[PDB]
């Protein structure tokens, strides 16, 4: 009766294998660049994920005690919270961390998706921004994806963001009634957030007015930092395109911002004020995240198929009812060094052999009255048809010599 | 400021590696026995986890829409729910499944723990019960644990459980006031549940009365099934002990029940009526679960230590400020086939070499004005002290020939 809640789903067979490949690939590239693997809890205190003061899409609840708890909606805040909790500030900087795991989004019935996160905390050095970009680019390239579009941009320093917001107030105020609910309130609290709302009505006005990009407002230091990042990518042969449409409305996002399109598979940027937001000292940061499901779809779109599940090394066919137990005893004697399976009911040799072929077994085994009395087994290498009769003590060795 | 909620914790370094080893080991033994890996969602409809009608320890909440949702507290019901949803009843039976993942328990501030689950659904054959036991025993043995105590027992068939409950009413009724709240109510709804309550007051009365074990109430079929299971373990050289104290109060638990002690690392048994409880047809089942943290503690108790984290293949030391970027370009050219790291600031050769030793690098690399002008690099195999000067084009090949 009960089914998996909408927005969630079981992962098994090929879908699971695709997810595991994707994560295994990120693990290889990220750990080769020094990132340390970190796994945070599924839920945390709600305040860990609050973005600041400024007036539904997060699973929140309180446990026995009244404490507000929230299901992890993103990875960055949780990782920064971990860097703080474990005093990673004492480690050699920067501290590179990565993580793969489920995230929770509360939309109307993906509500549970998986993403890989990479975070370099502790330094403002532009080399780290270029590295974050290249690392994301690489994870995706290593997966076999091609036609990857890298989009780069900057959101400047907070003093630069202050001027832009003023400008936004001047340009968007005389068009107030064109916005709506929240966007009208954002004009007084955080104008830049209006550029990040997915309100078709708000997106419409913006498209018509065509206001100036945050790029045109980069301060002195911000422009030099972006130029450094650009220089590194050029030097690393990473094709990119400056994107004035790339924006980050939250007050803790600074300088570098980037995305990789195929539509966006992942992206990220620098976020220097998030640590203080959580109660910690100043901790410069830059990193990215990409959705595992988004990537699996991109691979699927490019035609990437996955080979068939490997079969057991041995599939035992009991011929009599008494042999069923003996098949189990033999298979157990061969595990786990070898993958050995067995049928639970007797059947004709031909039908059993037929089942071994379908299951892709390397060898088929037969146990009947004759082999039981002799304490032996009959083996048949399916691929070559070669059939041999050997004692039970010799099966492990024989199979190992053959499957070497 | 904000810390991981009590009962939860970040996993990194050795602790994480220990968890990954444990799961990797279960994966090897369980998949060698034919189990298919399955990953269910973190949360599901509350009804998936309700055990039946009979009057706090589960994180429950409703999403936008009023639907009651619950954080996964166990693995079995979720797996059975998956077997049903995907029509696994059509697959060749039995269907063997396994899963590893977080579970949630709502105690007063582990509230988030991890466990490995194994489930064989679709058959009543006693061979499967013995296999579940041996498989659990094996997972633990392969981890290096010794002094593993296997305890076996049975809870009989529902008709057997009915008689026992009557008996329990007769023996425990005249002692009503000795029980408490729930236990008093259980006498009328499900007496056997009183044997499963962790109420020190209830455990006391039980210890004094010393009522008869559910074992003394096994019906004809139930006694024969248990004898079959025992026969298989004997034949598999698995040392076990019959435990009359092992009980399963819920109405869907049937026959086989078992545990492995070291205090219990894991356990399980047959549960034939759970499927119907969820709205599906009759689906016989048997399996087990063990806590990853329980196992890591057991390993720790036996002294099992984990080797040190491997170091990068190459740690680049820039000698000048301009070389910092060049160190990054070189490391990126070597990744991800090789693990290459670099320092972000210049430093003396000796200090840099000093850092490479501490980080356990196979090779140390040096980039200064001289190598930059020559488009070369200086490498030093730390273990042998051998130092060589080669061009950048030759570094990948040289390192690969040396780290082969």
Swiss-Prot record, chains A, B:
Sequence intervals crossing the membrane: none
GO molecular function, one term: ATP binding
Region named Catalytic: 1-160, 218-303
EC class of the enzyme, as a word: ligase
Family named by the database record: Belongs to the class-II aminoacyl-tRNA synthetase family.
Name of the protein described by the UniProt record: Histidine--tRNA ligase
Reaction equations catalysed: tRNA(His) + L-histidine + ATP = L-histidyl-tRNA(His) + AMP + diphosphate + H(+)
Tagged with keyword Disulfide bond: no
E.C. number(s) listed in UniProt: 6.1.1.21
Cellular component terms (Gene Ontology): cytoplasm
Coiled coil regions in record: none
GO biological process terms on file: histidyl-tRNA aminoacylation
Location within or outside the cell: Cytoplasm
Main location: cytoplasm
Source organism superkingdom: Bacteria
Gene it is expressed from: hisS
Entries under InterPro entries matching the protein: aa-tRNA-synth_II (IPR006195), aa-tRNA-synth_II/BPL/LPL (IPR045864), Anticodon-bd (IPR004154), Anticodon-bd_dom_sf (IPR036621), His-tRNA-ligase (IPR015807), HisRS-like_core (IPR041715), HisRS/HisZ (IPR004516)
Alphabetically ordered keywords of this record: Aminoacyl-tRNA synthetase, ATP-binding, Cytoplasm, Ligase, Nucleotide-binding, Protein biosynthesis
Subunit structure of this chain's protein: Homodimer.
Keyword Transferase included in the entry's annotation: no
Species this protein is from: Thermus thermophilus (strain ATCC 27634 / DSM 579 / HB8)
PROSITE patterns to which the protein is assigned, alphabetical: AA_TRNA_LIGASE_II (PS50862)
């Amino acid at each position: 009766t009960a089914r998996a809640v909408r927005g969630t789903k079981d992962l098994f067979g090929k879908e699971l294998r695709m997810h595991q490949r994707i994560v295994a690939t990120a693990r290889k590239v990220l750990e080769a660049a020094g990132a340390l693997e970190l796994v945070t809890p599924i839920f945390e205190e709600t305040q860990v994920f609050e973005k600041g003061v400024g007036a539904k899409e997060m699973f929140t609840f309180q446990d026995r005690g009244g404490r507000s708890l929230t299901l992890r909606p993103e990875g960055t805040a949780a990782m920064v919270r971990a860097y703080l909790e474990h005093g990673m500030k004492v480690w050699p900087q920067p501290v590179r961390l990565w993580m793969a795991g489920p995230m929770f989004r509360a939309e109307r019935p993906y509500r549970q998706f998986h993403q890989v996160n990479y975070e370099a905390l502790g330094s403002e050095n532009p080399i780290l921004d270029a590295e974050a970009v290249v690392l994301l680019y690489e994870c995706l390239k290593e997966l076999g994806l091609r036609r990857l579009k890298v989009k780069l941009s900057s959101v400047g320093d907070p003093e630069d963001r202050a001027r832009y917001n003023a400008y936004l107030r001047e340009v968007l105020s005389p068009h107030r009634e064109a916005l709506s609910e929240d966007s009208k309130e954002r004009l007084e609290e955080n104008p830049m957030r209006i550029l990040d709302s997915k309100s078709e009505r708000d997106q419409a006005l913006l498209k018509e007015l065509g206001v100036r990009p945050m790029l045109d407002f980069l301060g002195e230091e911000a422009r030099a930092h972006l130029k450094e990042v650009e220089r590194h990518l050029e030097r690393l042969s990473v094709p990119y395109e400056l994107e004035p449409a790339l924006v980050r409305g939250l007050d803790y996002y600074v300088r570098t911002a980037f995305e990789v399109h195929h539509s966006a598979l992942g992206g990220g940027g620098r976020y220097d004020g998030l640590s203080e937001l959580l109660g910690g000292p100043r901790v410069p940061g830059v990193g990215f995240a990409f959705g595992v499901e988004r990537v699996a779809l991109a691979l699927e779109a490019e035609g990437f198929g996955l080979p068939e599940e490997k079969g057991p090394d041995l599939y035992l066919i009991p011929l009599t009812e008494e042999a069923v137990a003996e098949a189990f005893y033999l298979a157990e004697a061969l595990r786990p060094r070898l993958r050995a399976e067995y049928a639970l009911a007797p059947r004709k040799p031909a039908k059993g052999l037929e089942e071994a072929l379908k299951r892709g077994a390397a060898f088929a085994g037969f146990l009947g009255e004759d082999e039981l009395r002799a304490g032996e087994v009959t083996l048949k290498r399916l691929a070559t048809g070669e059939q041999v009769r050997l004692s039970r003590e010799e099966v492990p060795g024989y199979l190992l010599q053959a499957l070497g």
